[PDB]
Each structure stands twice: as structure tokens, then as C-alpha cells.
């Protein structure tokens, strides 16, 4: 897709078109490009999708600013406040999050 | 707490020498000590009052039966004293 690395994919061979004539220089070299091409084809077939990463976030707001944080999260595209952990004995609302990098 | 004991503890690691009430000198790497001088050593020689040496791997020694313990001169320099 992007000339960018592949992730979370299987590659099971189905058939290999190997000729009768065998030479070690071509056989290997040819395979080298060809394998990649095959992989690409497979990816194309399989309804490919880019995967972006997600930062796991921790914020440590005071108590009363959580709404602000929420708003901010909403404003960004991918975003998820998974849990707003209450940091005991303190004002802080250690809020775990996910935000795409 | 006993300052000689402390010194002994510090010497842990070093090639200490060790004579008993019986008069049988040992010389080797100090492993462990306690409040009472319950010494352990490693890779240690053992010479009797006669002079015949005998090598041995791991020896433990009880402080009551220990006479005196020779530490290397390095611990004279520092630092538990002051």
C-alpha cells in the first residue's frame, strides 16, 4: 500500500511455479522479487487496510477539568477515555486514554 | 556495636587470614560474618601447628574458637572508622 511494513498477516503458500531447468543464481533471485509480489497480491485480495498505531495516554488532571479533557478528546479524531482512575488523597483524575499517534 | 566485628564484615570479599585456639592458620576469600564472628571462607588453605598445608573449598568457622583474623592493609585506609 505505502511501501510501509506489514502487520498481523499470515502467508500460506498455495502453489509454486518452479521450472524444470534449475540454476542457483536465477532460481533464488527470481524468488526474491517474486515472493514479495505474491505477498502484495495476497494483501490486495484480502481487503487490505492500513493500521495506524495508537498511543496509550495517561493524563492527570485535577477533579473539575475532566469535562475539558473530554471535549479535547472529542475534538481529536480517534480518541478514547477508557477509564478515569481516581488518584486517592489528591485532586488528580488519572485518566487512561487511547489516541492515534 | 562491635567495631572489630564491623571491620570483619567490611573485609568481606578480601583474602583474609584466620588462626584458631588450636593454632591452625587458614588464608582465603571471606564470604560471610555475623555479630558473633561466625566466619565463612572460599578457596582456602589450612596449615596446622606442624606446618603441613591442606587445601579446601568452603570452610565455616565459629568466633569462640577463632583466635584472631588478619585483614589486608587496604581497609586501614577507609571508611567505617571516621
Amino acid at each position: 500500500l505505502a511501501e510501509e511494513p506489514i502487520y498481523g498477516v499470515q502467508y500460506k503458500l498455495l502453489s509454486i511455479s518452479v521450472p524444470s531447468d534449475v540454476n542457483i543464481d536465477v532460481m533464488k533471485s527470481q524468488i526474491i522479487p517474486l515472493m514479495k509480489k505474491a505477498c502484495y497480491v495476497g494483501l490486495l485480495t484480502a481487503i487490505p487496510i492500513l493500521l495506524e498505531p495508537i498511543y496509550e495516554v495517561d493524563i492527570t488532571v485535577h477533579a473539575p477539568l475532566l469535562p475539558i479533557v473530554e471535549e479535547l478528546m472529542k475534538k481529536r479524531r480517534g480518541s478514547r477515555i477508557y477509564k478515569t482512575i481516581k488518584v486517592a488523597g489528591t485532586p488528580l483524575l488519572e485518566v487512561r486514554g487511547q489516541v492515534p499517534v | 556495636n562491635g567495631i572489630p566485628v564491623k571491620l570483619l564484615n567490611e573485609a568481606q570479599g578480601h583474602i583474609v587470614s584466620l588462626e584458631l585456639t588450636t593454632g591452625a592458620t587458614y588464608r582465603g576469600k571471606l564470604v560471610e560474618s555475623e555479630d558473633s564472628m561466625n566466619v565463612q571462607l572460599r578457596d582456602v588453605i589450612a596449615t596446622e601447628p606442624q606446618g603441613a598445608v591442606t587445601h579446601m573449598d568452603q570452610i565455616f568457622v565459629r568466633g569462640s574458637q577463632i583466635k584472631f583474623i588478619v585483614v589486608p592493609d587496604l581497609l586501614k585506609n577507609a571508611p567505617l572508622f571516621k
Binding site: 485535577h62 477533579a63 488523597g89 489528591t90 485532586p91 | -
Partner: protein
């Protein structure tokens, strides 16, 4: 009393802004250090063909990570990057009270 309040109102931040000809909207503005030599010439770098615009890259972010978000920074000082200040002062004449925050579980 909270030191973290002065985020992008530091002297350093101001200096950075001045360098980068980038007003933090609240704060001051100056003649640029360097004249904006607009001579990119439609190169293959920083083109709108190439880059993506999920973030708007606000000039708030410029003075916060000068060397990153701004390209060709010059005479730019490094800013601070701080801890939060939980400091509670009693205004009703009382003594050592967990008022504004919440108790432990156990």
C-alpha cells in the same frame, strides 16, 4: 503559586516566539529576527501533495517543541516541561482537611 501556569508565558517561550515570528496570541510580538525568504520553489519536501493534515500544527505547538514542529529554527532557546501542582489553601479558617479531593478506598 502553581509554577505550571506559565506554560507558553515563560521568558524562554517569549524568546522562542520572537525568533520564530510566532505570536502566542495572548503574548507579545516583534519584528522577526530573520526575513521570511519565501523561496521554497515548489519542492518535493513540505508539499501539500505529500503531507497529511490531521493536526492543524498550531503556533502554540511551535514554541513548545521549537526544534521539532518549526523547521529552520534559529537562536531558539529551550523551554520547560513540567509537573502538576496539587496545592490546597483553606480560605474558611480551618486546619488540615481533605476538602477538594476524595478519600482512599481501604
Amino acid at each position: 503559586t502553581d509554577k505550571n501556569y506559565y506554560y507558553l508565558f515563560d521568558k524562554k517561550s517569549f524568546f522562542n516566539g520572537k525568533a520564530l515570528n510566532n505570536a502566542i496570541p495572548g503574548g507579545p510580538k516583534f519584528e522577526p529576527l530573520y526575513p521570511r525568504e519565501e523561496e521554497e520553489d515548489y519542492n518535493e519536501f513540505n508539499s501539500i501533495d505529500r503531507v497529511i493534515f490531521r493536526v492543524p500544527i498550531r503556533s502554540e505547538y511551535k514554541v513548545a517543541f521549537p526544534h521539532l514542529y518549526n523547521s529552520r529554527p534559529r537562536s531558539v532557546r529551550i523551554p520547560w516541561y513540567n509537573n502538576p501542582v496539587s496545592c490546597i489553601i483553606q480560605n474558611d479558617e480551618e486546619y488540615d482537611t481533605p476538602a477538594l479531593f476524595f478519600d482512599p478506598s481501604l
